[model samples]
Target: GGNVYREPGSAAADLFERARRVLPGGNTRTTVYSAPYPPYAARGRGAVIVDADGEERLDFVNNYTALIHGHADPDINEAVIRQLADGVAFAMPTEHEIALAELLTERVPSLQQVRFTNSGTEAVMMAIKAARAYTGRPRIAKFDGCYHGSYDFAEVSTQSSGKPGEDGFPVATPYTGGTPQAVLDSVVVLPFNDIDGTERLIEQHRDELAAVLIDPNPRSLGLYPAEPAFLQRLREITRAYGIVLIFDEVISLRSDYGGMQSVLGVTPDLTAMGKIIGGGFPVGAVGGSAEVMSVFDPTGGPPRAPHGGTFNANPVTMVAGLTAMRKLTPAEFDRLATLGQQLRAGVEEVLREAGVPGQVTGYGSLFHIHLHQRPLADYRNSVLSAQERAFVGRVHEALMGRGIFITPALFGCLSTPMGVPEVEAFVDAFAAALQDARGLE
Candidate 1:
């Protein structure tokens, strides 16, 4: 009657029932919400996650790419343990903060200065606030289908109905309901990968816009990538209009040593970062050119963008992040990227062999599996239909049954701990899972 993995009286079933009594939909994080119920993870190590029922699955999700080195990395744990002994959080800043900031600033071209936050959402929120403070403007522009975390500003016009409203231009819509009309009006929705449309939109709002938020490689819209020339034009127009361009590198930062900005060679004024930098801990950061980041500067006077968070750059997190990032040498990035290629190619080969109408898209360690053959043009064109998405859910269940743990939406990433063998095994499993899916179909 329910998930076979979770029997009536099993540990996972019991946990879900209890969670339903307290949490909405028996979940706190909506991303992991499976159809019947989600499995409770007992522990993780290397690239494997053991659920509460003691079943181990290859962790392709890697906590949505937060655990870049995978779970329980010895070095990261040792560093965090040492910092834990000293203290966790302190009112005063620690050298660990400076160390992490210095490492990021040195690596990322746009990160001349940096400030930490507790999550990617906060990082994006602060980036938006900084732009507003610096430009004295009220509105912000975010690309359609580009996820910039949970902040209200970024959430506006995100979950489109795949249909444009009256007048044919992208209308300001709310991802989260109960968002006020004023909030919607304050945001300008831009078409993804459409430079001509974007230029026109920015020109209309040039005087009122504070920032244009983009992700060089947007994971949400089926991992549809940003064209280099499109990003270049966005850079030019934003610079011309004095609008701060913010790149949400929270996921894409895992793509390169200097992040997607380095790969694309189109640096933004500010960048919101999270995921791999956290070392499997909670962390986020907003970094940018010294001139643009001055809104957060405390040395001169009260920061124009006043910000406070209890866990922001706590020494424990700082040490963990610094240790994790230090371990991610340039060679490691390339190695993980190679592994990604193997996975992508292998999966595509499987799709072709099975004659499944699917295709894969991604770069470096990040990737997504599209169950359909639809061309990814823009947000509206690429948004999967209800039937297609439900099929993805079926495929996700099949993959999990085959011992692979990836996002239900099929977004996946490779951790440095994963190698060619692991990737090959995953591909084999995917091939079998596709067969299983055919049976379900």
Candidate 2:
């Protein structure tokens, strides 16, 4: 009943076998390369992808939420075509970069000045550096089960049951193989939304803490909407200790006009944005107040951290990003949230109808269908046990066979491509998938 092409098939299996000779583990990225999944994609249209087998399914991942306007959007494609004719890059500054920055500044309140990077990982690394430089302290804090980027500093005490977080990472020390102990020493792990725990840690180690960098909505484990009071507490405490408060909106920027922090009505000293802001291109940014961001100004007092990449703010990416944002209006955002609401409700109804022990967890525009009735307070509750994981895996596989594509492990972000009908499909698919899994058991 379940169709899991995420594993090797005839062509994909052969392709992976050939690839493993040249590339370790048969691919570059561990997350996507795992279990020898379909090695290639044929083509993508709006809300659907025609795989190598000519199989089409509604696309929900949306290229990690970067496709805000859906795939091959005319405006975005036209902008790309126009930029291609004009040349993609140059050595000097360009107007498109300024235009994009200005648009972002207008949308988000905390950004007085902004600098671009090529990836969320780089932007977050620079944000951490800025916080440390601004505070003149060594240590930084992050919530458990959240991803900032691939830097040595941010990977400590991170998400996982892996021996040392992700494979090839340190078994005893923090980050992976290449990270130094000094950087690892600077990171402190904290639980999400545990305001009392946050307060205790800050008070106990106020002198050494530089900043508490957090993602208000962390979807890695599962989606848990952060309460405004918890955010306000961080703001007040960080101010008390002169510790910089940073919000990593790498994924949550889709929640509202001013980033996720703006939605909560509490502001962070600095914000990191990427993903959806970049359209389908790779781009990242670290922005905040002019005074605070001045640390990155080379010609100013005290040397700002030298952060630059060759491809940062390239014209092609800027145009794509601009077109994507221009297409996403207030109505589009409202529509996405509305669809998400329906999706959540549908999942809830399906679970009830099937008498399955489950609940739907999500925030404004992101949702997780967990096979548990109780609310997930932490990663353990968020994840299914060995037996439950198998059941969810069956459901994931079944849904894929039904042409209802989503994250293989039952995680996904809804987009404007999907609507009420799509939500109903998800609901019907969930019930059918659950019934099939139960029968197999």
Candidate 3:
């Protein structure tokens, strides 16, 4: 009875139909929703996901880059089981939270103090609040297409499809309806990598700008990295203007032992983190210097900004996150990076051998496949043509059939559990998908 398209009549389709009766678009998460339907997972083991339809596929997406150790990791599972047996939450504090905080502060240099949140979105939200309180500035500056979660102001121009302004800076465009006009007015959208224009714009808005948040290397923006020069410039300019420089490393922290800031050797005033830190659970955190993080303190007097949540530092997430992160040693990161390079080189080689016009861009364990042949540095230019994007989606769908699971947008990330065999499987699946796409072309 369900008639969307691909893989209809499967158990996934049936469940999706049942879901659509109540949930919007038959799925709660928009990113997981595809044209026909999303596969309902029966279970995940290590680096493989078995869908409700009884199809098993190597997990390349890794829960949008959160499952760093892959699904159902032994250590993470054991930690959660032990924690559950004791207790999950309490009205009081837990030792595990402090332990995780200590580990994060030690690993990431810029983070001397840390605060927890329920998700990355909440982490960014708190960071903005802290910045505004610290600097007493209302406006926030961010690069185009750098997603800092659903915080209203930070979201401005994140997915702007409108034409660039006459000055070439992207005008702040809302990602969804109902964003207040005041939000659009408060956000200063700068062109990514356009150092001259960005510097001038930052200077223009310096007095009112409280924070400048960025994802250093935005995966949705084709995984093209921000120029080191540009990052350095932002650092210098923001420092001069007393603007809080916030690195949204929610996804990119998995890139290295000390996070991307360590890899780039540029430290931000505040860093937001999530995903892998939670050990496949929902989690987010913001960390910064003790001085800046003092806004949350109430020992002396009224805090600058009041913060409270029932699950802020729940023992369950803390234990799970700590266990998962403990496994990401320097040596483990090196392994993931090596595997990432191997996959990147292999994919590019496949494209060259297939005579396909495309490029694979990413760092560490993260990668994105862009079907366009042209040079793509920014979000505007990196976007594939509608036809090309649809083709890429088809390719991913074909890959799913071949037991290689990847995001419809062709984004992939390796987990600690994945290795040479998985990488080789991906390359083979990709080559076949490309050939099939070529036949359609």
Candidate 4:
């Protein structure tokens, strides 16, 4: 039963054949892609996904941390159903937008005001524009390997190949091909957790820099956290230089009720957010003190930056997000954190029992498996070697056969639908799965 999954004439195989005719490589989103092909989802309930082939997998991926409450949550579904009868989208403003904005401002420390966007990428882009408008500067800086979103300016030096200290803290390089030289020139990459190197770069670029964007717990950097001293210094330096400090809490917001800023105690001037905030719909927002967010205020004589969107704060997303967020009390956050700690400890034990050189790193509900003995700190140390990556892929296959679903990269998160028993199941399954993968090179 622990053998690798092999579904002959699998619907996914048939679907892939047709998908190749239209979608490139049978994929629209790159993150969800599998090596041979991926099974299609049929339906899901709390903590479980039923594939097109009528197979069940414990849903740890949770749409890459979007579905904190798990798939098709009853409350979220009910809220959306009520909203649909009224209407979905409008070019004009609505009460739903005000309600969600009110909740966010009341909860998040830095958000005295807020503006909505269609996606996290848009949120990051808008925040960058707002920073430039408010500060009158030309460049933005981001932490190396910390993903802000899919934008030209934010894409520079994302998981870059160049090693630090190669040419004085590595050169700014494009993540995607044909990115204009101007785009590279506009971004200065800062090494995460390296306070000394980061401080020097920030000082050198302070005059031209509009903002310094960072993820307090950068997901791509193996959930490598920012050193408290480093984050504090970054805040001080940015404040002294009149440069806005933007936290890309798009993924890290799941850390707490008030977001990661609350957990870390170092609030940013701006936060770009998405995922769980949408209650599983397309949504994003850039919020901060009214002074910094005022760039988007048209009431101030066309403002400094103009923002327009057809579905900026659609009633459906607002209602669903509000309902979902309301369920996330201080007590709820603490419960998730407790579960997160258990998970990390349990998985670490499994690695030891299996005699595998692996480690689990995370905080709150997030967790990532690194099949190496190395201690993680930054991008350079986080990137897996070819053989290690291949071995992880084998483990991923073994896990899938055991009715578990996680990102191929072995990144996972716990949902509210889960409890101690479910976590225990995962640990047991992981132990068995390791045996299946032990023979692999």
Candidate 5:
């Protein structure tokens, strides 16, 4: 009954109108854009967010899972402030970079050396370059629906819904308008978790395939986890074919102490990381064996792929990220995983009791809901149909009205600050929101 903000002349609506004058489509990040208007966040404190319209809500989205410690974390804030006094950026290398790199290499098994970037997109671009330079191959193989940032080849078949390949995988298609056909042609699309199919595809494109890029747990594509068997197969085949296996762990690294590869017991040739690694700043990294990472080393003569950024390994991000990482003990990860299990169970029960056809998918702190009872094999045939997707959107909007902020896609993650109370609150809100959505329909 209280969908007033859905009406015109809302503060967010006015802000969006103002923003449209400066920015295309009233926003820069496409994911944050809602149909009517997206709420303008005023500030965040702990696990909650207060929007521009003075509405306070639980922040389950956690800046799309980047804020692992939640908003305004004391340690992170203090580290950033201390680094701010020291200076933010410098042309010379900072000790903070070495400290962070050392910490990451010590934790992540596959990383013998590391290089930094400003975002995951650049990490992936550099990883691809490293692979091509190392293997002298031009083609990159990636699964359909797996997101590796916005790189042209990595983005091919990202939202693929067009013609299917001869082997039943989606034909590589550009996600954005005017994406070059050459980029699309450079990517070999394979089906997720289809071991035999993927193996055959690898063989078919063996000579040209430089790297096989994937997200062990692709959060953007419904948080569907690739099977450990599938991952093991990829590792084995890539090794056999002289192709690099690149794990896009930018989102999934939050799942475990040693990254998702350690959890799954399968390692990759390279790992692309971002999000929580930067402690909420704009940061990214590519880590791999020293042999592969030597492409970036200057001591051994000219660098294979020259990488330089104005803000690369800047002190502020390095300090904040290091502080946050140090604070995230193994015990904290276990606690987050426990809360996630509780949330998943509670939400499943709520859906069942409400007579709704829905199920939750995720591991550790992350979660996503599909408004369908049936099992979903892949994005090509998603459990959530267009109508179901619209229904979930209504549910998210209703949840927001109930002071529970999650992604419009009903995806969320638990932060260090969130506990059982937050999980129970979200379940209660979700049930009420589902009912509210039903009434609107």
Candidate 6:
């Protein structure tokens, strides 16, 4: 019984089939539906989630680290209460938005100007458009394993195998159906940490590249921290060739109080942010120096690019984001980091004791549990065989059954509410799950 979750049986099966009739592949997002079988969340509170099966589990997903304060925190509840009294949305701008932007600019040195989008995808899209418009370049560069969102460009190279990439995956095609073949030529995909490969790519396409976009840490697959020397090299090459460098911190902004790239002491020309910006609601932002931002203005101040979303910067999301950011003080961030370290240490110790051949990957609050000993630095390295992935899948199922819900692949993020005891609970679950996995073998 390889971590079998037998509760979601016939009823769950019926629901899945019904959902397929309404939504494409029975889902809206790829990651949620990407699992072998999806677990429907019924409710969440603090660090726990109860699924449709009425199973209670310590929540490690935290909606991909967007719920740092944890579900229904007193501060969030109070803020939401105040906001509902004031009304949720409106046709007018809110003062809270201004405060949110100002606080972010104050914290992130490279972010002098900012504009909110509805999601991380939109933030990355806007950043690319701004970079392309400002530089008047025809193409962009990306790392193989990094994911910025669902945008056509961000999706390419998302899953790569050494040579002849995935089948029927348009040779160098962007991630969607409607994306044009012409747009494919505009993107240059390079494997991460290959400095020599980057140099070769720049030398080959320097004339057409507008910018090189990267997510300093993308835990969707597994966390592979980008090296500082590699980041500096990208900047140096891009600067020498007049190419813009874009940092997609859609998820990594929570990696540190100063931002993920801040820890490396490397800055980008444009930084895309999401998740934490909107608080627990939906929000995103694209920011950089005023010079780059001037392109968003139309009065001959660098011909602006057109970007419009009706719900962009909605009042409710703005308020929520403001509340979330304001509550995340320097002390709280330090606490989360300390807790994250403790959690990681505890998990590794369990692995060693259990004699499990696996390693935990990720940064700060975000962590990934890979069933492998060595680091998987690139796409080919990260992809697991069906048997191996299935092993982790079983571990996840067992963990969930025991009341600790993390993603099936063992990717999760911790929140402020979780401490050492909660962390130890996850470790115990991992050890128990390892025993379960061995039983199947």
* TM-scores vs. true structure, each candidate: 0.97, 0.92, 0.97, 0.97, 0.97, 0.92
- Residue 260 CA displacement from its true place in model 4, Å: 0.9
Which tens-of-lDDT digit does each residue in 334-403 have in candidate 1? 8988889889999999999888988999899998998888778566657777888777877888788878
The stretch of ten residues in a row with the least summed lDDT in candidate 5 is: 375-384
Error of model 1, residue 199, in angstroms: 0.7
lDDT of 6 by residue, 1-441 (tens): 222334446344566778889988789877677444576777778887766656678888888777887777777667778888887766777787787888889999889988889988899989999988899997898877567878887677666534644531214644666778776677888767767777778778999998899888766447877777887898889989988888989889988777988987888889999887776888889998888878887566545787667777777787778888888888888877788887888888888888887787767788888789766654456777888978887787677667787877788888878888888898887888788878943
Model 5: per-residue lDDT, tens digit, 285-306?
9999998998889986999878
Candidate 4 has its poorest 10 consecutive residues by lDDT at 1-10
Error of 1 at 163 (Å): 1.0
RMSD to the hidden true structure, all candidates: 1.7, 3.6, 2.2, 1.8, 1.6, 3.2
Evaluated against the true structure, the overall lDDT of model 2 is 0.78
Model 2 stretches astray by more than 4 angstroms: 1-9, 160-179, 378-380
Off by over 4 Å in 5: 1-7
Q: Candidate 5: deviation at residue 326, Å?
A: 0.9
Question: In model 5, what is the error at residue 89, expressed in angstroms?
Answer: 0.6
Query: What local distance difference test score does each model get?
Result: 0.88, 0.78, 0.87, 0.88, 0.88, 0.78
- lDDT by residue (1-441, candidate 2, tens digit) is 134444556556667778789988688776665453543556787777666666667777776776766667777888899889989888887999999999999999889999888988888888988988888888988866677778877777565543324422223245466667777667766657667766876777789988888887877757776777888988999998998888989989888877788888887888988988887899999999887788788884656577768898999889999888877788887888888888888888888877888778776677888887656664446655798878888887778788777776677877667678877877887788898889943
345-431 per-residue lDDT for model 3 (tens digits): 999999998878788888889988888777656557866678987788778768888888888888899998888999999998899
Over 4 Å off, model 4: 1-8
Error of 3 at 22 (Å): 2.1
Ten-residue region with minimum lDDT total, candidate 2: 163-172
Worst 10 residues of 6 by lDDT: 1-10
